[PDB]
Amino acid sequence: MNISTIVSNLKDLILEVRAPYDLEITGVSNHSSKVKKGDLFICRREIIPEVMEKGAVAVVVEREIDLDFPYIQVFDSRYFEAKVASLFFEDPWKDVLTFGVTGTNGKTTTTMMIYHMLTSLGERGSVLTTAVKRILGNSYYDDITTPDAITILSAMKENREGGGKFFALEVSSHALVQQRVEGVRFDVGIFTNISRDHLDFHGTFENYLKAKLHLFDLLKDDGVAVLNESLADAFNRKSRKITFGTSKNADYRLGNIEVSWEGTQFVLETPDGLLKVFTRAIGDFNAYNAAAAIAALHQLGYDPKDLASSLETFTGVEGRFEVVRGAKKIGLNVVVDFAHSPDALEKLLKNVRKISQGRVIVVFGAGGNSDRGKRPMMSEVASKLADVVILTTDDPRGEDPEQIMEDLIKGIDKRKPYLVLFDRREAIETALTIANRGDSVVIAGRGHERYQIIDEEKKVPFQDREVVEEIIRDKLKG
Ligand SMILES: Nc1ncnc2c1ncn2[C@@H]1O[C@H](COP(=O)(O)OP(=O)(O)O)[C@@H](O)[C@H]1O
Ligand SMILES: [Mg+2]
């Protein structure tokens, strides 16, 4: 990539070029920590001198630099980033069936199903969500809540070069703001749901919604919008719509949801046929995720029946309704989830409620340095929908843990039996003991998380699911 190529292709973003038509560019980077030699560095709104010695050929910037150094000055750094990136990796999206999945809820599950449902129906590609990155064959499991434009596009160019014709990507409501995914074009576009409350919230609801529709700008004029029925009319653009839902007039229409410890069983009316679907993952919410997929997928002449038979193998996402099926070995069934909203909490308990023929006991705490006030109402939820509530320490990052517990304690209905134990290890041990023949013990807050973060920097090992299994191995022992 010449600078001549950049300027040429992307001229209108660029305000002023003070740089040789020459400076071949070898890579792109956003953090100083990460600069290679020859890369172009993009300075987001002192460091300039630093990043140049580290080996930077030139630097993008939003205001006048005034330094001896080769620099493209742009109208909007962050946008520019996306766009450049798309070039330097050479638009990896044209060659690969790309999927973007946004919504308030169900991003990860829906994306992961797509992923699973393609590999499983034979095929090779790549997924990239919050919870699971699989870069080609590799499941490079690691640090992916802080990806930018370059990291995503990077990872789509491994996919294509390594010969996969599809990339399944979760489009965070966050990420549409960054503009992380602005240099992309998607072949399909799933929009799962939208909350009218004050979950996932920026402005009013219209600002909240509009920003989530933007995805469909970023959509190939070839490809399709896969929409929730309840958002039918909101679709302000002019492209292919496929609806799903329960209304009798949605393109794909899902029916008799039947959640049980074997999983969600539902019945989906495709607009050419009709079929049983069984996912193994538990939760009624899992039917609008499944439906959204069998739609998007089958909107490319994949035989439905066969797609539907895919979902059978899908056993949820690690840390999301993870049943410790290995607990029946005692006398109990145990659920690990990650719920850190009043909301996910409620959904969970209702589902364990439906599915559980017995008492439901809930171990949870709250994370340091999220909302301080959404805390006592998290307890409020659990105080209602659960027979016994065991309150334990979570990841009190910065926060002093006993100054979290106070905040949580207010929402507990003091009339019902609640129990407070500040050591997660003992909370869990206890709940297993006080719970009976065939009760359900649910542990929330953490999920697949691998350490408990007490100190900003000082953290001990604690895998929620595993400690459970540990205590069970120990009880059975004697
Ligand atoms: N279609 C849906 N409608 C309502 N709630 C959902 C849906 N899909 C998932 N959820 C719930 O929302 C929470 C987060 O969903 P998740 O699959 O993690 O998407 P995200 O990655 O956007 O959080 C989960 O605890 C789950 O119970
Ligand atoms: Mg998420």
From Swiss-Prot:
GO cellular component annotations of the record: cytoplasm
InterPro entries for this protein: Folylpolyglutamate_synth_CS, Mur-like_cat_sf, Mur_ligase_C, Mur_ligase_C_dom_sf, Mur_ligase_cen, Mur_ligase_N, MurE/MurF_N, UDP-N-AcMur-Glu-dNH2Pim_ligase
E.C. code: 6.3.2.37, 6.3.2.7
KW Membrane (keyword) present: no
Main location (coarse class): cytoplasm
Gene3D superfamilies: Mur ligase, C-terminal domain, Mur-like, catalytic domain, MurE/MurF, N-terminal domain
Reaction(s) catalysed by this chain's protein: UDP-N-acetyl-alpha-D-muramoyl-L-alanyl-D-glutamate + L-lysine + ATP = UDP-N-acetyl-alpha-D-muramoyl-L-alanyl-gamma-D-glutamyl-L-lysine + ADP + phosphate + H(+); UDP-N-acetyl-alpha-D-muramoyl-L-alanyl-D-glutamate + D-lysine + ATP = N(6)-(UDP-N-acetyl-alpha-D-muramoyl-L-alanyl-gamma-D-glutamyl)-D-lysine + ADP + phosphate + H(+)
Top-rank taxon: Bacteria
GO molecular function terms noted in the UniProt entry: ATP binding; magnesium ion binding; tetrahydrofolylpolyglutamate synthase activity; UDP-N-acetylmuramoyl-L-alanyl-D-glutamate--D-lysine ligase activity; UDP-N-acetylmuramoyl-L-alanyl-D-glutamate-L-lysine ligase activity
Involved pathway(s): Cell wall biogenesis; peptidoglycan biosynthesis
Gene Ontology annotations of biological process type: cell division; cell wall organization; peptidoglycan biosynthetic process; regulation of cell shape
Modification N6-carboxylysine occurs at: 212
Keywords assigned: ATP-binding, Cell cycle, Cell division, Cell shape, Cell wall biogenesis/degradation, Cytoplasm, Ligase, Nucleotide-binding, Peptidoglycan synthesis
Comment on pH dependence: Optimum pH is 9.4 for the L-lysine adding activity.
Subcellular location per the Swiss-Prot or TrEMBL entry: Cytoplasm
UniProt-annotated binding residues for ATP: 103-109
PTM comment, free text: Carboxylation is probably crucial for Mg(2+) binding and, consequently, for the gamma-phosphate positioning of ATP.
Cited function: Catalyzes the addition of both L- and D-lysine to the nucleotide precursor UDP-N-acetylmuramoyl-L-alanyl-D-glutamate (UMAG) in the biosynthesis of bacterial cell-wall peptidoglycan. Is also able to use meso-diaminopimelate as the amino acid substrate in vitro, although much less efficiently.
Note: The peptidoglycan of T.maritima was shown to contain approximate amounts of both enantiomers of lysine and no diaminopimelate.
Family in the record: Belongs to the MurCDEF family. MurE subfamily.
Protein name (record): UDP-N-acetylmuramoyl-L-alanyl-D-glutamate--LD-lysine ligase
Gene: murE
